[PDB]
User: What shape does this take?
Amino acid sequence: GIPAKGTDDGTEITLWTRSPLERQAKNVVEAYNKSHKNQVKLEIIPNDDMEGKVGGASQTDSLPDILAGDVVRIPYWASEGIFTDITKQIDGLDNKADLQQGHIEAGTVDGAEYTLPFITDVSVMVWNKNLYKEAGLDPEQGPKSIDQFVEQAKKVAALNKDGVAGSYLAGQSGGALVFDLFPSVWADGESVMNKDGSEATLDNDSMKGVLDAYKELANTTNGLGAGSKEETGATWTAPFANGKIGVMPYPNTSTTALFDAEKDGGFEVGVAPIPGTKEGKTSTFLGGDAMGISKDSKHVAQAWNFLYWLMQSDAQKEVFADQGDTASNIQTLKTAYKDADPRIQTINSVIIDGNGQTPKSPAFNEAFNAAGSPWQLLVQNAVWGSGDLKADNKAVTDVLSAQ
Ligand SMILES: OC[C@@H]1O[C@H](O[C@@H]2[C@@H](O)[C@H](CO)O[C@@H]2O)[C@H](O)[C@H]1O
Assistant: This one.
């Protein structure tokens, strides 16, 4: 940071991250604070509050020592000078090639590198094995295609049980919707953006299949749980956690809660990679938060001590693997989970297999995550409305390129 492994001298370091990653953030900070003189003062911020909080703090130069941001948000923040240039420190890491590359790439602008992985968050398919058995489905057969996803959701919908639906769609969360829907497109070998991130390529047969799948469930009695049309992103993981949804895309960072509920006598959870339109094709969204040292830090060496510590396979095993969470370190993924719950090892295989993507655009929030983004309207038109996929896609590109 200035020293190789930074300075551990009893400095209080501030770290900001977001509510969806709260369980993993707690584990990381608890472990750091138990093993260092330095202490991290953790703030966990609601997902939708980070843009305005970071923007406001940038203007009053009160950004924290360590800022973690959604990997889709980082390219913009890094372009605005939110982060201190740590190119030489990242480039000195012996194990740089083991670190989740999408998170480093998110923070790469003009040869400068600003970020490392903080918490990996990947999208997977989860299903309720109890509802599957009740519906006459094989409880171990996750969907291998978007068609099979529809069939399984429809059999759970046909149970006609109070508050039970086949699937659930985060209708008003552009962010949840990229996370949940992009992988089906990538699984098929299609793209959602051009290489620059300046154009949307969403008007494709795989995206149309995915939207038509959710349209079918929208037009099925009990197809999509109540709340799907209004879901802001604040509650989208709750209906499945509550045992009310047959099958849906889901964050790996929320699965440990499900595995725990199951150990405590709750319903049994299936996990599989998100499938393509094409039988047996799979992908994921290589998301989560990357972290950098803010432009406002007066403890760069102490912040670097945290950044350095977390990249090590030791810390990655302690804070991720030993807590049943997916690590940001591929060497940790390949070595530290040999006796983990098979569903954890299945989740890790969607990183190791290499079929996932991290979308990179300076305009990503404005085009995708933002409330009433062109992407949110595109999905809404296609699922609950009349879609014009060509027109809606061009609305996304007009934000991506303008400017
Ligand atoms: O934001 C894009 C990726 O999706 C996941 O985050 C989601 C939020 O956008 C949504 C609103 O909270 O909750 C989801 O967990 C990944 O963490 C992001 O990289």
